[PDB]
């Protein structure tokens with residue numbers, strides 16, 4: 478196993494992130510800097526408005542989804558609230574941290590959707606947080622029921638880049654212009670266009686958070702159940718920055734949040750924000766043969782958590798070409814092909830919309846679980862780990878989750894102990910077993926044994942989140958799962974899922 482990192486758990490310069498502290502060290506007093514101030518709660522955030530007005534700092538946003546302000550502030554003034562420059566002497570009260578509001582930037586071709594399903598995401602609305610949507614594209618017409626433009630303030634949908642349209646169509650395109658061939662994963666779903674990225678595909682953290690905020694504020698009005706963020710930076714993140722917090726909070730408000738892993742692989746620790754947010758679904762990219770792409774970002778997070786959780790097709794994906802744009806590699810007037818974890822992301826968002834159509838009562842955690850547990854183990858010796866996560870999502874299995882046999886095991890393992898559980902299986906094309914546990918400081922591993930008692934799969938990442946094993950055409954008989962503490966104790970749960978019959982001996 479890879480030796481791990483630190484840890485370590487106290488790194489900020491008072492209120493300033495290290496990155497922001499360095500930034501302002503090279504600046505002079507009268508210059509301006511764009512920041513996000515995260516407070517410990519909403520009332521503390523509110524108290525600070527009057528003080529920031531006094532100093533003449535300019536509040537760009539006052540957020541609901543996080544207790545934070547997006548603030549443009551002179552260095553001298555920022556030194557004052559940071560407690561680094563005495564009039565106080567005191568740090569601004571109730572501040573958790575102040576970060577930089579920095580800028581985010583975004584052939585064998587293939588269709589996104591290789592399935593025919595009974596569901597199509599009817600009655601579900603997906604928010605596309607991106608460059609916009611070309612709602613005049615034949616595959617999207619009448620779909621865009623909601624719209625906001627935080628870049629230019631235009632009040633009618635458009636897309637001046639191409640990226641957001643391509644993404645929107647992978648998620649929910651009807652495929653009308655190819656008679657279905659390049660439909661998205663959720664052809665019956667509605668869309669809301671949330672433009673936070675400019676024509677160059679660039680945007681500020683503050684704008685992206687505001688787009689997440691808007692989606693949450695407006696979730697009831699437009700029936701938003703899923704949001705899509707095909708955007709991020711890839712500076713290794715621990716998922717505690719303002720944008721990560723915002724997407725985690727949006728998850729808790731009841732939205733399925735689906736985020737691109739990033740395109741900065743194959744190196745490990747290339748998962749940044751908001752890819753690192755623990756709660757959301759972070760999505761890597763495979764090519765058309767189910768092989769992880771070289772560019773797909775690898776985890777773990779900066780704090781050693783397992784990311785991405787799943788991967789999806791993200792290499793030269795054909796989808797809607799926004800009127801007047803030419804992103805990637807044009808196929809014809811209506812369609813263009815592009816690679817990226819940005820293409821993988823909406824594939825998963827649309828599947829999420831199927832599942833929510835199929836199961837109106839499912840929470841986001843339930844959607845995430847079904848995706849993880851049903852994902853195809855396309856590369857057994859690398860699953861679960863920080864390139865493939867749990868494997869490549871399978872829209873058919875995810876959507877038909879409930880038709881499958883299930884078995885749940887639980888127990889406790891002490892430091893370096895194990896537990897085993899036998900189960901019987903027959904008539905199966907597949908079985909998977911997925912392991913969770915409570916103690917995030919503990920590393921548990923998962924092993925799967927055939928009826929001869931021989932190990933046919935293992936899952937032993939060092940990085941905490943889950944473990945995942947399974948087998949295709951498992952021979953009928955009594956199989957064993959073993960839960961092993963590599964280090965540390967925990968209470969655990971293993972879900973076994975199969976299309977065969979599942980029993981106990």
Ligand SMILES: [Ca+2]
Pocket residue numbers: 856857858859860861934935936945946
């Ligand atoms: Ca494995």
Ligand SMILES: [Ca+2]
Pocket residue numbers: 920921922936937938939940944963
């Ligand atoms: Ca492990």
